Amino acid sequence: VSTSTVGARRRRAKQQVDDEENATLLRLGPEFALKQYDHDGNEHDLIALSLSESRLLIREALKARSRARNGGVIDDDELAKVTSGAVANGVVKKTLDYLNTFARFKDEETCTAVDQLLHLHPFEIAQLSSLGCEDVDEAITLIPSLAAKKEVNLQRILDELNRLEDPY
Amino acid sequence: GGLRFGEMERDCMIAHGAAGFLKERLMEASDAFRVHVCGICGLMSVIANLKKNQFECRSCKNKTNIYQLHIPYAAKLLFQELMAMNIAPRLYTERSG
Amino acid sequence: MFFLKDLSLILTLHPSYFGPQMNQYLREKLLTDVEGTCTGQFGYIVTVLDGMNIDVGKGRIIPGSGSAEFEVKYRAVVWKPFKGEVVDAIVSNVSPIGFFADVGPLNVFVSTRLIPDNLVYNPSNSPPAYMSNDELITKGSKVRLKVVGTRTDVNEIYAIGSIKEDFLGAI
Amino acid sequence: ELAILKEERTTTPYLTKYERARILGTRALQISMNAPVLVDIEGETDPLQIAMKELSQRKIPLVIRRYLPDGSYEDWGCDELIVD
Amino acid sequence: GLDGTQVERQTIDTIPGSDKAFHKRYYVDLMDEKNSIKPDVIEYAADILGDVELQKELNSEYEQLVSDRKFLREIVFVNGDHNWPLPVNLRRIIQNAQQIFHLDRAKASDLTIPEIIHGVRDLCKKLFVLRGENELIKEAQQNATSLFQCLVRARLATRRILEEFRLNRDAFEWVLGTIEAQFQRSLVHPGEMVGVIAAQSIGEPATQMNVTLGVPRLKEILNVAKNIK
Amino acid sequence: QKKAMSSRAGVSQVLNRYTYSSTLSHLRRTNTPIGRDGKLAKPRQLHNTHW
Amino acid sequence: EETVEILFEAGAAAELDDCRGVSENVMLGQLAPMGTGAFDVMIDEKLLTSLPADYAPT
Amino acid sequence: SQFPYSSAPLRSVKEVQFGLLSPEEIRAISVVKIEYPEIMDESRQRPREGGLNDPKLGSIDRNFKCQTCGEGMAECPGHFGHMELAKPVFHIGFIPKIKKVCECICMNCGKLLLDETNPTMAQAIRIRDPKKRFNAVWQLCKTKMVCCGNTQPVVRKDGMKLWGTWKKSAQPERKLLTPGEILNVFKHISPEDCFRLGFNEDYARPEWMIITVLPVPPPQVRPSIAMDETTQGQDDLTHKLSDILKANINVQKLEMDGSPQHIINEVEQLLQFHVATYMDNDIAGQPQALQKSGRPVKAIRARLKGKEGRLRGNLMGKRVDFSARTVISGDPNLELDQVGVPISIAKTLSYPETVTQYNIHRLTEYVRNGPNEHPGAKYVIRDNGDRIDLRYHKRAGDIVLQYGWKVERHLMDDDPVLFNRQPSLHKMSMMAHRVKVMPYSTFRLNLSVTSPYNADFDGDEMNLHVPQSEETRAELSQLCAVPLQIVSPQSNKPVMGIVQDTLCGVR
RNA sequence: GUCUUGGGUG
Ligand SMILES: [Mg+2]
Ligand SMILES: [Zn+2]
Ligand SMILES: [Zn+2]
Ligand SMILES: [Zn+2]
């Protein structure tokens, strides 16, 4: 049913342990390869979306499909309705409320700013846009992979992030 | 009984270019069957329970990449005899190289 | 976590539907079919980016049946948990044997044995909830909780977490 | 990737006997499954003869994808291939 | 590139005969009064004589015919045989054109020489066995239709068209269009199982059949033998 | 019986009683056990000494 | 010919059969890449969208 | 549509990748280990688990289902078991290649005798084809008699026993090479070494040519039969597997007690011979595994080869439904592309015709007429595949035909049918005709078509095939029809001419 | 309901 560009994965005689998920250790599964592909087979960098990029994309898609339904003619509790099916509406309502309960970047402008500033592994890249962290300690212990890369810059990046973080 | 649509009849159908008629003679007018193959190992060792909607190739520990194929019952029997003599006819539904 | 996902859906169309407004009918069928489903290999399909602008391409007639096949490829958004990933939530249910917290499109339940022991349950409080010196896991609380288990059931999956580890639990 | 632009299509502009036979069979099967009919049906009720009428009037909504030996292909609508 | 049901034995008329007979059949002369077109067949008979900007085209036609003569006699058919299976029966086309356009009463023909020559030249560049702007495609296309072009030029010669067949312009255009269409119909279709067809066409005659011949010799040939009987 | 292979077959046959002349002919029949494995046309040939 | 020996050799050398032939598609009961099956028949949308709007999927 | 719904996608075979079955994978795909010889439970119902008729192997019975998959005999494919062998044995179909690999490799440390240092082999490696590469490596590596530094043996074959002569340094001590020793030597070949000889790391490992665990086929591959209403004999493969099991257990009765070295070899060789003749009973220079009736056992190889074997007898050609045969007759009053079909055959054969808003009156008249009157119908197929037999249905008047339903009406005038006379030497021996339904029991042919069929009317019989769909009807009428075959490509001339009396009469 | 043998037909 639900399939993707991941195709054969044919059987070599030696089997492997790498199917074990552990997000502390950059093991995600053979569906989120470090270099993705598209539906035209062209190579493309992996996507790992923070809550901000995701919130913008979902709001945009729902209002776009509503504009499509209306012939060309505002709130998540309403904006999730665009789907088809009661389970669909419920799931998307929970997702949108989850996004609007934790979206520190509540606009496309600051999302663009963080996009420029950030562009490094997309996992921690998005988790920084998702996880407010005071100093180096919270980041390097909750995300243990920033240690063995010797390009941290967490101090100032997090400072400017929490500075750009809107009130609540 | 039925009449034999032998090899020379197949030659005449091939000369005529009637591929659909040949497939219909050899399948729907004869031993047509449906088997499940493992999408990973390509052996007909898949355990299908159709009323419980559950499938499994135990050897590969697989339950999701399984396909159905319509093939002659004589072809299934041929592959099982080949397996009986330690050959693995692996039926793959997509080309790699 | 939300993942952008390139995904496909093979479909079959009867000749009776072979009309002038075909592509939009297939678009509506796709949108109905995929918007909400779970798959153990991908996560949860909440929405689809640019839903009305999916390309159905050109369908192929199956020899012998007369129905058209389409490989409608498109890029969507999927949400999948992973054991050892931290996910925030808000509590939904309460019970002596633990509480439920809604995570993404799911609901996560934490067991009694996996909770800091300063937390005490109360069947008699107004409102009923877990309580401690200077803390209250009332209904509508926030919970930064880690996932330490996810079973894959084809339609709906369930994850049982543990707030027993540092920097986790009530916030 | 494997599709050929409509300008450098170097196969025959004529419907072959096999393409005509398969197109007529497929159209007949479709019409026998209560598919819509593009021609004006005047007298005949047999789906094969209706399909022949549609083929002559260039009103069969199908496409032939002609595979080359190297895997590439050319696409030709039935209405633009020439029928003898 | 032709389907094996579509070809019929036809004589190539530039091949046989002596050089004098060839010259009398094919050579026209404009300045020379007697060896020109018979005046009583065309409207413009008096206007023809003495021209030069047309005798050039007549000489080009005759030189192409001599090229075909030399080619067929020295490369293709060295032993003189001129009756070979070829697509599109031109005898039948010409007689059908005569029947359709009623070529009796030997009426003055309104069909000018330059139009005849250019019509046959254009026709020879419209018989497509291979389509494409590539250069090897062009070479293979011309190699494909060289013999058939020899036939079409041996039949549709200026003297023959004007004197022997007495066609007018309408019958001429009909002959060209019919050659176009019937040649496009004589081509093999992609998808033919020509290997199975060839195997059957060779094997079936074997069922009805001191040099070794027949079945034992065919068996030696197909089962390639290091020594033969 | 246990050596049915390597034994001559068809030495005994069901008497043909379809018509009278068929019976009379079956009772006077003869068999050369050359076998059909082999395309030697020589023993199949009508010979002068057959007169 | 030599069916069993050839199959044994195919096993012992891991031959990959492309299935582009005639006999191979015959024994698997599929449409051979031959004659009427040497091409594909798609569903045309460009010609289809000319139909009356009342002949539409509902 | 006559297959119950499965949720898997339907696909077609694009690639076949042959291989050997690895002993790991043989154990993995199995569903039950097979070790107990005896067939029945104890002359009773519900047979011995772990025998050759384990219900885990699948169902071959109409009122029983497969305990492995939960399906009845109409739909259960069958499931494989496995049967571990006491000693490893040669695969009968791989002894020559085992011998070749033994000659090529170092039989102590598992390494190629020569390296890329020698440029002849260094260029023999450069062949892409595994078989050509293997030949180019064997034609060189087979003669070097040393590696470690141990000398190489001269491998030889005597029956199923691979002898290897070690010429030390005089007397060359010749020892028997058992399958287990060769298996141990073969497991040590490194992946790149293995690649060089032409094998594969994932699909064909040279030690898999030695059998250590044997697959047991489901009962579908070896079904029983009924003699007189109460009797059954097992298939040859079943008795052969039972003999193999007896041999295995006898082997396990020697390494557990006294065995003066002339019984271990004998019983292990019995296992080897049973396993060999289970697969190939046409081995040169030895007796054949026999039946107590004196016939030889029908081995799998004998099942697969020949005019009557699987490939040529069941896959390249097979018996088909919806066909008819009878004597042919001549009819001056038929058209060239017409064939006269007897009424009885026209009623026995049928065509499934989908009900549409252009054929509902005609089809409902056929449904009312019934299967004993022409033109009638035999079956009504509902929109899900359920058949309504109109013989036993007493109430043929109470059927209303739905759209999309299917009526299997009789054979009728102008139906295209394929008509055929054997032998079919050329494409015009099989031609498509329009039907005309007639009295009396012979087919009717216009007399000009007897030449392409090579037929006459003094006993000849011809076959008639009815296309069961609209696509095959269209194919017949637009490619195989008699008018389209008048000119042949064999000699670019006609094949049908005016014949016999019309020729004499027109003269 | 199966395997061999034999007699035949085009
Ligand atoms: Mg006869
Ligand atoms: Zn598998
Ligand atoms: Zn089963
Ligand atoms: Zn060594």
Domain architecture of chain C: domains with CATH: 1-82 (3.30.1490.120), 83-171 (2.40.50.140)
Distances (CA, A) of H356 to D15, H98, H161: 30, 65, 71
Q: Which nucleotides of I are covered by protein (CB under 7 A)?
A: 1-7, 9-10
Smallest CA-to-CA distance from H65 within B63, B76, B50 is with B50
Q: CA nearest G37: which of B94, B71, H475? A: H475
Are the beta carbons of H469 and C63 separated by less than 8 Å?
no
DSSP A167: P
* CA pair distance G45, D62, nearest whole angstrom: 8
The full set of domain ranges for chain B reads 1-85
Residue at the smallest CA–C1' distance to nucleotide I9: H459
Q: Do the beta carbons of residue H264 and residue H77 sit within 8 Å?
A: no
Q: Give yes or no: residues A78 and A29 share one domain.
A: no
Nearest alpha carbon to residue A102 among A158, A48, A51: A51
Which residue of G lies nearest to H299 if distances are taken between CA atoms?
G4
Q: Which residues pair with E187 in a beta bridge?
A: E2
Burial class (CB in 10 A: 0-12, 13-18, 19+), A74: exposed
Q: CB–CB of B20 and D25 under 8 A?
A: yes
Structure tokens at H116: 């890329």
Q: Which residues contact E72 (CB under 8 A, 6 or more apart)?
A: E12, E14, E15, E82, E147, E150
Interface partners of chain E (CB pairs < 8 Å, 3 or more) are: B, D, G, H
Handedness of CA H263, H267, H270, H276 (dihedral sign): negative
Q: Residue H458: exposed, middle, or buried by beta-carbon count in 10 A (0-12, 13-18, 19+)?
A: exposed
SS3 string of chain E? CECCCCEEEEECCCCCCCHHHHHHHHCCCCCCCCCCCCHHHECCHHHHCCCCCCHHHHHHHHHHHHHHHHHHHHHHCCCCCCEEEEECCHHHHHHHHHHHHCCCCCCCECCCHHHHHHHHHHHHCCCCCCCCCCHHHHHHHHHHCHHHHHHHHHHCCHHHHHHHCCCCHHHHHHHHHHHHHHHHHCECCCCCCHHHHHHHHHHHHHCCCCCCCHHHHHHHHHCCCCCCC
CB contact under 8 A, D36 and C18: yes
- Reading the block at residue E195, the tokens are 């290997």
Chains E and F touch, contact meaning at least 3 pairs of CB atoms under 8 angstroms apart: no
Residues H94, G8: Cα–Cα separation, whole Å: 8
Write down the H helix ranges in A49-153. Answer: 51-69, 76-79, 86-100, 108-118, 122-130, 136-142
Which residue ranges of H make up the annotated binding site for Mg(2+)? 456, 458, 460
b/e per residue E28-62 (b: at least 16 CB within 10 A): bebeeeeebbeeeebeeeeebeeeeebbebbeebb
C-alpha distance from D84 to closest chain C C-alpha (Å): 24
> How was it solved?
cryo-EM
Kindly report the three-state secondary structure assignment for every residue of D40-79: CCCCCCCHHHHHHHHHHCCCCCEEEEEECCCCCEEEEECC
Ligand whose nearest atom lies closest to the CA of B58:
2
3-state secondary structure at position C162: strand
Q: How far apart are CA A89 and CA C105, in angstroms?
A: 10
CATH of G1-37, one of 3.40.50.300, 3.40.50.720, 1.10.150.390, 3.90.700.10: 1.10.150.390
- Nearest to H337, CA basis, from H488, H478, H499, H483: H483
Beta bridge partners of C111: C98
Compute CA distances C41 → A28, A90, A108, whole Å.
12, 22, 31
Q: H59 with H72: CB under 8 angstroms?
A: yes
Identify residues of G whose CB sits under 8 angstroms from chain B CBs. Answer: 7-8, 11, 16, 18, 22, 26-32, 34-37
Q: How far apart are CA H140 and CA H133, in angstroms?
A: 11
User: Do B and G touch (≥3 CB pairs < 8 Å)?
Assistant: yes
Measured in residues, chain E has a length of: 229
* CB pair distance less than 8 Å for D67 and G35: no
User: CA quadruple H391, H396, H399, H403: dihedral positive or negative?
Assistant: positive
Q: How far apart are CA H75 and CA E14, in angstroms?
A: 73
Give contacts of A10 with chain B, Cβ < 8 Å: 40, 96
Residue H394 CB neighbours (<10 A): 8
Residue H478 identity: Q
Residue D6's identity, in one-letter code, is K
Angle at H399 between CA H396 and CA H402, to 5 degrees: 145
How many residues are listed for chain C in this entry?
Answer: 171
Are both A38 and A60 inside the same structural domain?
Answer: no
Q: How far, in Å, is the centroid of ligand 2 from the Cα of H272? A: 30
Nucleotide nearest the Cα atom of F5 (by C1'): I4
Contact partners, residue H90, CB within 8 Å, separation at least 6? H98, H160, H162, H179, H209, H210, H211, H272, H276
CA angle H175, H176, H179 (to 5 degrees): 140
Note the CA–C1' distance, H233 to I1, in angstroms.
Answer: 11
Q: What residues of E are in contact with residue G35 (Cβ under 8 Å)?
A: 191-193
Give the containing element (helix H, strand E) for H463.
Answer: strand H461-465
| Size of chain A, expressed as the number of residues it contains | 168
E116 touches E84 (CB < 8 A): no
CB H465 within 8 A of CB H320: yes
| β H338-342/C2-7 pair status | unpaired
| A57/A27 same-domain check | no
CATH of domain B1-85: 3.90.1800.10
- Whether any strand I atom is under 7 angstroms from the Cβ of H504: the reply reads no
Closest listed ligand to the CA of H454: 1
Q: Whose CA is closest to C23, among C46, C54, C2?
A: C54
SS (H, E, C) E159-182: HHHHHHCCCCHHHHHHHHHHHHHH
Contacts of B84 in chain G (CB under 8 A): none
Nucleotide nearest to H328 in CA–C1' terms = I10
Half-sphere exposure of H304 (CA within 13 A, CB side): 27
Would you list the DSSP string of H131-177? HHHHHHHHHHHTS--B---PBPPEEEEETTEEEEEE------EEEEE
Specify whether A40 is located in the same domain as A81.
no
Q: Bridge partners of E161?
A: none
- Total Cβ atoms within 10 A of residue B53: 11
Residues in chain H: 507
Asked if A81 and A89 count as a contact pair (C-beta separation under 8 A), the reply is yes
Mark whether A127 and A63 lie in a shared domain. Answer: yes
Torsion angle (degrees, nearest 10) of CA H194, H196, H201, H206: -40
Q: How far is CA H158 from CA H171, H211, H229, in A?
A: 20, 19, 48
Beta bridge partners of D82: D14
Q: How many Å apart are CA A51 and CA A64, to the nearest integer?
A: 20
Q: Which two tokens stand for residue H174?
A: 């010749």
Beta-carbon contacts below 8 Å between C and G = 47
Structure tokens at H500: 């016999």
Q: Do D67 and G38 touch (CB under 8 A)?
A: yes
AA identity, residue C112 = T
CA distance H18 to E10: 54
Q: What is the CATH number of the domain that holds A82?
A: 1.20.1250.40
Is B57 marked as a binding-site residue?
A: yes
The token pair that represents C58 in the structure block: 């050109």
Query: Chain H partners of B11 at a C-beta cutoff of 8 Å?
Result: 424
Is B12 known as a binding-site position?
A: no
**Contacts of residue E87, Cβ cutoff 8 Å, sequence gap at least 6:** E2, E6, E7, E8, E148, E182, E183, E186
**Prior bond of C20 cis (ω within 30°):** no
Distance of CA H394 to the CA centre of its chain: 43
Residue A154 and residue A92 in one domain: yes
Instruction: With H, G, I as helix, E, B as strand and everything else as coil, classify residue C52.
Output: helix
Which nucleotide's C1' sits nearest to the alpha carbon of F9? Answer: I5
User: In chain E, how long is the greatest CA-to-CA distance?
Assistant: 73
Is the minimum distance from the CB of H425 to strand I below 7 Å? no
B72: preceding bond cis by omega (within 30 degrees) = no
- What distance in Å separates the CA atoms of residue E126 and residue E112, rounded to the nearest whole number? 21
Structure letter (DSSP) for residue H297: P
Strand order in the sheet with H173-177: H154-158, H161-166, H173-177
Is there a single domain that holds both residue A83 and residue A95? Answer: yes
C-beta atoms surrounding A134 within 10 Å: 10
F33's CB contacts (< 8 A; 6+ apart) are F8
Positions of chain breaks in chain E, given as the residue before each break (C to N > 2.5 Å): 209
Structure tokens at C117: 């022991």
Q: Would you tell me how many other CB atoms lie within 10 Å of the CB of residue A44? A: 13
How is domain D1-84 classified at the architecture level of CATH? Alpha-Beta Complex (3.90)
DSSP structure class, residue A85: S
Backbone angles phi, psi at H427, to 5 degrees: -60, -15
Name the nucleotide with the smallest C1'–CA separation from H226: I1
Omega prior to G52 cis, within 30 of 0: no
Q: Which of C20, C59, C63 sits opposite G43 (nearest CB)?
A: C59
Give, for B66, the enclosing helix (H) or strand (E). Answer: strand B66-72
Of H221, H316, H320, Cβ closest to residue B80: H221
* C-alpha closest to that of G27 among B31, H471, H4, H73: B31
Residue of G31, G34, G41, G43 best to disrupt the C interface, most CBs of C under 10 A: G43
CA-angle at H457, arms to H455 and H461, nearest 5°: 65
Residue found under tokens 């339903």: H405
| Closest partner CB to A11 (pick from H7, H202, H205) | H202
Q: Which residues of E touch B12 (CB under 8 A)?
A: 200
**Do G48 and C19 count as a contact with CB atoms less than 8 A apart?**
yes
Provide the domain count of chain A.
2
* Beta bridge mates, E87: E7
Q: What is the 3-state secondary structure (H, E, C) of C79-148?
A: ECCCCCCEEEEEEEEEECCEEEEEECCEEEEEEHHHCCCCCECCCCCCCCCEEECCEEECCCCEEEEEEE
For residue C61, list its beta bridge partners: C68
Task: Give the whole-angstrom CA distance, residue C37 versus residue C46.
Answer: 8
Q: Is B38 annotated as a binding residue?
A: yes
Q: Supply C154's token pair.
A: 């084809």
In which domain, by residue range, is A24 found? 1-48
* Touching pair F, G by Cβ (3+ pairs < 8 Å): no
Between CA E83 and CA E81 the distance in angstroms is 6
**Chain C residue with the nearest C-alpha to that of A66:** C52
Given a contact cutoff of 8 angstroms between Cβ atoms, the answer to whether H244 and H274 are in contact is: yes
What residues of C are in contact with residue H471 (Cβ under 8 Å)? 63-64
Answer whether B59's CB lies under 8 Å from H29's CB.
yes
The structure tokens listed for H179 are: 């399958």
Query: Which residues precede chain breaks (C–N over 2.5 Å) in chain A?
Result: 73, 119
N- to C-terminal Cα separation, chain C? 20
Say how far E160 CA is from I4 C1', in Å: 78
Q: Which residues of H337-369 are buried (b: 16+ CB within 10 A; e: fewer)?
A: bbbbbbeebbbebbbebbbbebbbebbbebbeb
CB within 8 Å of A139: residues ≥ 6 apart: A128, A131, A133, A146, A154, A158
CB B91, CB G17: distance < 8 Å = no
d(CA B87, CA H117): 36
What's the gap in Å between the CA of E199 and the closest CA on chain B? 10
Task: Decide: helix, strand or coil at residue A110.
Answer: helix
Nearest-angstrom CA–CA distance, H48 and H39 = 7
Centre a 10 Å sphere on the Cβ of residue H400 and count the other Cβ atoms it contains. Answer: 8
| E191 contacts B11? CB cut-off 8 A | no
Cα separation, H413 vs H411, whole angstroms: 7
Helix axes E55-71, E113-124, angle to 10 degrees: 40
- What's the gap in Å between the CA of D3 and the closest CA on chain C? 12
**CA-based nearest residue to D65, from G43, C133, G45:** G43
Extract the tokens encoding B42: 């390509």
Q: Are H81 and H27 in contact (CB under 8 A)?
A: no
Return residues 48-87 of C near H (CB < 8 Å): 63-64
**A102 and A82 fall within a common domain:** yes
Q: Taking a C-beta distance cutoff of 8 angstroms, is the pair H66, B33 a contact?
A: no
With a CB cutoff of 8 Å and minimum separation 6, the contacts of E14 are: E22, E26, E65, E68, E69, E72, E150, E153, E154
Resolution (A): 3.2
For the record, the structure tokens of H3 come out as: 């297959």
Establish if H422 touches chain B: CB-CB under 8 angstroms.
yes
